[PDB]
Amino acid sequence: TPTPADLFSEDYLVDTLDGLTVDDQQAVLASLSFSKFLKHAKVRDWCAQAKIQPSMPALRMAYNYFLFSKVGEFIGSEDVCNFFVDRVFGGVRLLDVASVYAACSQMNAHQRHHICCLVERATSSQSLNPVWDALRDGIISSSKFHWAVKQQKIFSPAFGLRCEEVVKTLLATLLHPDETNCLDYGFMQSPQNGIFGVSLDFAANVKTFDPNCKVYEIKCRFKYTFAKMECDPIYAAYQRLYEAPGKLALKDFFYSISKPAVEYVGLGKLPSESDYLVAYDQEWEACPRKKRKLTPLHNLIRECILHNSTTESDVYVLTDPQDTRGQISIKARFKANLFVNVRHSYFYQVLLQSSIVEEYIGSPKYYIATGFFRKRGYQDPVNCTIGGDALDPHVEIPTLLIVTPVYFPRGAKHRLLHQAANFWSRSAKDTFPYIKWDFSYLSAN
DNA sequence: GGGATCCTCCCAGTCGACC
DNA sequence: GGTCGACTAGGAGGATCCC
Ligand SMILES: [Mg+2]
Ligand SMILES: [Mg+2]
Numbered sequence A: 001t002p003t004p005a006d007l008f009s010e011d012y013l014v015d016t017l018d019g020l021t022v023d024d025q026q027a028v029l030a031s032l033s034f035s036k037f038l039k040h041a042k043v044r045d046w047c048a049q050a051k052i053q054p055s056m057p058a059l060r061m062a063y064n065y066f067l068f069s070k071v072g073e074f075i076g077s078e079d080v081c082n083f084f085v086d087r088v089f090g091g092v093r094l095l096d097v098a099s100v101y102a103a104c105s106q107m108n109a110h111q112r113h114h115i116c117c118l119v120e121r122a123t124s125s126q127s128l129n130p131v132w133d134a135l136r137d138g139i140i141s142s143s144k145f146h147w148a149v150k151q152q153k154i155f156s157p158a159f160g161l162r163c164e165e166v167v168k169t170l171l172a173t174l175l176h177p178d179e180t181n182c183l184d185y186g187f188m189q190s191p192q193n194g195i196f197g198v199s200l201d202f203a204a205n206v207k208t209f210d211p212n213c214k215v216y217e218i219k220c221r222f223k224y225t226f227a228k229m230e231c232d233p234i235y236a237a238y239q240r241l242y243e244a245p246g247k248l249a250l251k252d253f254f255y256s257i258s259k260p261a262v263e264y265v266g267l268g269k270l271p272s273e274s275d276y277l278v279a280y281d282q283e284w285e286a287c288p289r290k291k292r293k294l295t296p297l298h299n300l301i302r303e304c305i306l307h308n309s310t311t312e313s314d315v316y317v318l319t320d321p322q323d324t325r326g327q328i329s330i331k332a333r334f335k336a337n338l339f340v341n342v343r344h345s346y347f348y349q350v351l352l353q354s355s356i357v358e359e360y361i362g363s364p365k366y367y368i369a370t371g372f373f374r375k376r377g378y379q380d381p382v383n384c385t386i387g388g389d390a391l392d393p394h395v396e397i398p399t400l401l402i403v404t405p406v407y408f409p410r411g412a413k414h415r416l417l418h419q420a421a422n423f424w425s426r427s428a429k430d431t432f433p434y435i436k437w438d439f440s441y442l443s444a445n
Numbered sequence B: 001g002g003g004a005t006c007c008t009c010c011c012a013g014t015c016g017a018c019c
Numbered sequence C: 001g002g003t004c005g006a007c008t009a010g011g012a013g014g015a016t017c018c019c
Helices: A024-029 A034-038 A041-048 A058-075 A079-088 A097-104 A109-121 A142-149 A159-175 A233-243 A247-254 A296-306 A345-359 A410-431
Strands: A196-198 A202-204 A214-221 A262-264 A277-279 A313-318 A330-336 A365-374 A397-405
Touching: A034 A058, A041 A097, A058 A079, A058 A097, A058 A109, A079 A109, A142 A345, A142 A410, A159 A202, A159 A214, A159 A313, A159 A365, A159 A397, A196 A345, A196 A410, A214 A345, A233 A247, A247 A330, A296 A410, A345 A365, A345 A410
Parallel strands: A214 A365, A262 A277
Antiparallel strands: A202 A214, A313 A330, A313 A397, A365 A397
16 A cells, blocks of 8 residues: 555565565555556556557456456466466567566457466355455445445445354254265356356355355354343343244244344345345234335336245254353254245345356356344353354354255346446446547447 | 444325315 | 325445454
8 A cells, every 4th residue: 555566567566565464565566457457557548559459358468467466376276377477478488568468368268267266266265365355346246236236335445253163163063964065166257248256155066166065155144142131022032032943933034123134025025135044924013114116117126026935944943062061063953934035135145156057067056144143141152162163262153054955047147247347337438538448349248 | 254233215004284 | 074195204225344
């Protein structure tokens, strides 16, 4: 930030990021982003010409070359650049943007695919990776997708992570202990357009990308934290759920707070965006409440609901470690007619991820895994264990684990992808006018 | 990135003008 | 008293601060 790096210079990054911490480094790398790339003088001059009309994903691929040329040595992977020179550049170390772009525009789909894989593997460190901040810039990531679809930036000038790891430990140790899984995924760019990008949290049963595996998106709920106090309605509802695991006691639990994770959606009614779980069966209704109707202007919603109202969630009540001397395991497992809210952000995020996993394969099963946590109490064991693994004494305690399947109608998946891609284009044009963008091939890819 | 308090917008059931 | 129109109940979703 005080020492912004140049993507077009032989200066050594390492020379500038030895001292800094793992967090000031990312700030230094945050200046090697796509946005900063586009606004570079070398790139402006090149674009200023009357012939040059840059398209995607060619321009993203060019960017990848320069980025990994700059940070190759730092992250300890020179494979990306080695492939660019070996297979794309005819064996020449291209240094000018005009020539790098030309060579990039002559890549086939198999070659873009190969780069994006190499990039995913080189960033499988995730947050621990300082390039993460440079890479995710200018791209529609899973967390920007929903926003991008509603046209509601893209280019720019933790405790929660500890809880996700807990949910991950749960899935790896308790659900899929007898299978080979993958706990670490890097940043995954779209090889076909270079405007979308994601990373996966966890995958079970992967071959030694696997189209037959199970991909989990890991989330966390905290609104259902409770102190172990007699008077506490949440705690009380929890005790009933803990002793009598089932839909009825689950309902009471969910509704023990003002703003529940589950919403009852009646016939011809429009689901709100309040939370990520819906129920269509009236058995989940509590008190009659007005609800906007599903008008003919909601065929998207209706199509998505159509394909997400059959396969039920799996609810896992976890053993309280206070009663089990530390060990946290599955006390009870039951199914529930609760489904993913297709209008909630979580639906979109897993939608993008499923789309991108497709490109890296050319179907796997997709689930949202959500852990419900509570703050530790004075009598909670400090050193808890989950199967073999241990639990961080500083992280909250998981009480519930709900796994919910997600399905994506091809027709809805497409319109949403294309809507976001258009917002990206309009933003690209507005943010970088000096660039005579060529989106002809984009509107069709 | 989730949660809660506050604040805005507006659909929908309510109820007011009126004949 | 009944149709329609205007009124207001909460539904619904954004922005901020906190953590
Ligand atoms: Mg996640
Ligand atoms: Mg989460």
